[PDB]
Symmetry: C9
Subunit: 85 residues, 9 copies
C-alpha cells in the first residue's frame, strides 16, 4: 500500500525532471545561439577573433549559470526533498 513519501518523492522526481529538461533546453539553444554569432563574426573578420572571445564567454557564462543553478535545485528536489514526511 502507498505512503505519503511515495507521492512526495514521485512529485519530486517529476519536478526535478522539469527543472533539468528546461535547463538543457535553455542551455543547448542558448549556447548554440552564442556560438553561432562567434562563428559568424570570425568568418566575417577572422582577426576579430581575440576580441570576440570575451563577449562569447560572458554570454555562455550567463547561459551556463541558469543550467547550473537549475541543476542545484534538481539536486535539492530529489536528494533532500523539501516537505518530505
Amino acid at each position: 500500500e502507498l505512503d505519503p513519501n511515495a507521492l512526495i518523492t514521485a512529485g519530486a522526481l517529476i519536478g526535478g525532471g522539469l527543472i533539468m529538461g528546461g535547463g538543457a533546453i535553455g542551455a543547448g539553444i542558448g549556447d548554440g545561439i552564442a556560438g553561432n554569432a562567434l562563428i559568424s563574426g570570425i568568418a566575417r573578420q577572422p582577426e576579430a577573433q581575440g576580441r570576440l572571445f570575451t563577449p562569447f564567454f560572458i554570454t555562455v557564462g550567463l547561459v551556463e549559470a541558469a543550467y547550473f543553478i537549475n541543476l542545484a535545485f534538481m539536486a535539492l528536489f530529489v536528494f533532500a526533498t523539501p516537505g518530505l514526511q
Copy 2:
C-alpha cells in the same frame, strides 16, 4: 496511508519544477539571443565594444529578473507552500 499534505506537497514540487524549468528556458535562450547581437556588433565594429555592453546589460538585466523572480516563487511553492494544511 496518504494524508492531504502529501498530495499538496507533490503538486508544489511539480509546480516549482515548471516555474524553474520555464525560467531556465527563458533565461538561457534570452541571454543567448542578447549575446548574439553583442558578439556580432563587436565583430562588425571592434571599437563599439564599450558602447554595446550598456544595452546588453540592460537586456540581460530584464531576462535575469524573470529568472530570479521565478526562482523566488519556486522557493515559496516548495519551502512555504500556500495551501498547506
Copy 3:
C-alpha cells in the same frame, strides 16, 4: 486521509506553476529578442539611437505586462483558489 482541498490545491500549484513557467519563457525570450534589435541598432547607428529606446521600452512594456498579468493570476490560483471548498 485525503480531503477535497488537497487535490484542488495540488491542481492550483500545478496550474500556477504553468502560468509562471510560461510567463518567464515569453518574457526571457521576448526581451532577449527586443534587446538584440536594440544592441544591433545602437551598433549600426550610434547617433540617432535615442529614437530606439522608445520603441524598445514599448516592446518591453508589452512583454512585461504579459509576465506580470500571469504573475497576478498565479497569485490568485495559489492564494485565492477559485473553486476551493
Copy 4:
C-alpha cells in the same frame, strides 16, 4: 474524502494554467519579435518611424488578441467551470 468537484476543479486549474502559460509564451515572444522589426526599421530609416507604427500595432493587436481570448477562456475554466457537478 474526495468528491467529484475536487477532481473537476483540479483539472480546471491545470487546464487554466495551460491556457495562460501558452498565452504568455505566444504574446511575449510574438511582441518581442514585432518590436524587434520596429526597432530595426527605425534604426535603418529613422524617418520611416511614422509609417512603421501602423504595421506594428496591427501585428501586436493580432498577437494580443490571442493572449486576451486565452485569458477569457482561462476565466471560464476556473470561475465557471464547464461540466462542474
Copy 5:
C-alpha cells in the same frame, strides 16, 4: 464519492487547455514572425506598403485558422465532451 464523468471532465479540461495553450503559442509567435517581415519590408521600401499587406494577410489567415480550429475543438472537448458517460 468520485463518478466516471468527474474523471472524464477533468481530462477534458486539461486537453482543452493543451489545445488552446498550443494554439496561442502558434498564433502569437506565427503572427509576430509574419509581422516582422511586414514591418521590415515597409521600412526598407515605404511605397511597398500596399503590396506587402496581401501576402501578410494570407499568412495571418493561415496562422489564425490553426488558432480558431483549435478553439472549436477545445469547445467540443469542454462543452460536448466525447466519451462522457
Copy 6:
C-alpha cells in the same frame, strides 16, 4: 464509482489535446516562417514573385499536412479510442 473507460477516455482527451496543441504550434509557427520569406521576397523582387507562391504553397502544404494528420489522429483518440473497454 469510477470505471475503466473513465480513466481511458481521460487519457484519450489529454492525448488528443497534446496532439492538437502540438499541431497548432507547428502550424502557426511553420506558416508564419514560410510567409515571412514570401513577404520579404515580394518586397525585394515584386516582378518575379509569381515564382515564389509556388514554393510557398508547397511549404504550407507540408506544414498543413502535419496539422491535419494530427487532427485525424486526435479524432481517432477521442471518437474511436484505441484500447477502449
Copy 7:
C-alpha cells in the same frame, strides 16, 4: 472499478499524444524553416531554382523522417501497447 489495462492504456494514449504533438512541432517548424530558405533563395536568384530543389528535398526528407518514425511509434503505443496486461 478500474483494472490494470485502464491505467496502461491511459498512459499509452498520453504517451502517443506526446509523440505526435512533438512530431508536428518538429515537422511544421522544420519544413517552414526549410521552405523559408527555398523561397528566399529563389527570390534572390530566380534561376537558382533548379539547383535548390535537391537540397530542399533532402532537408524535408530528414524532417519528415522524424515525423513518420514518431508516427509509427505512436501507432505501436496505442494499437499494440507494449506492457499491456
Copy 8:
C-alpha cells in the same frame, strides 16, 4: 484490481513519449535550420554545392545522433522497463 506494473508501465509509456516527442522537436527543427543554411549557401553560390554538403552532414549527423539515442532510451523504457516489478 490495479497492480504495481500497471502504474510503472503507464509511467514508462509517458516517459517514452516525452523522450521521442522531445527527440522529434529537436531533430526536425535542428535539421530544418541546418538545411536553411545549405539551401541559402547554394542559392548564393551554386558552385559551393559540394563544399557545403560536408558541414551540412556533420551537422545533421549531430542532430540525428540526439534523435536516435533518445529512440534507444525510449525503447529501453517501454520494452525493458527499469524498475518493473
Copy 9:
C-alpha cells in the same frame, strides 16, 4: 495492489523522460544553430574556414555536455532512483 515503489518508479520514468526530452530539444536545435553558422561561414569564406571548426567544436562541446549530463541524471533517476523505498 499498488506498493510505494510503483508510484516512485512511475515518477522516476516520467522525470527521466522530461530530462531526455529536454536534452534532445536543446541538443538538436543548439547543434543545428551552430552548424547553420558553420555552413554559412564556409560558404562565405572557403579559405579561412579552418579557423571556424574550432569555435564550432567548442559550441557543440557545450551543447553536447548539456545533453550528456542530462543523460547521466536520467540514468540515475531510472537505475538508482533517489528516494526509492
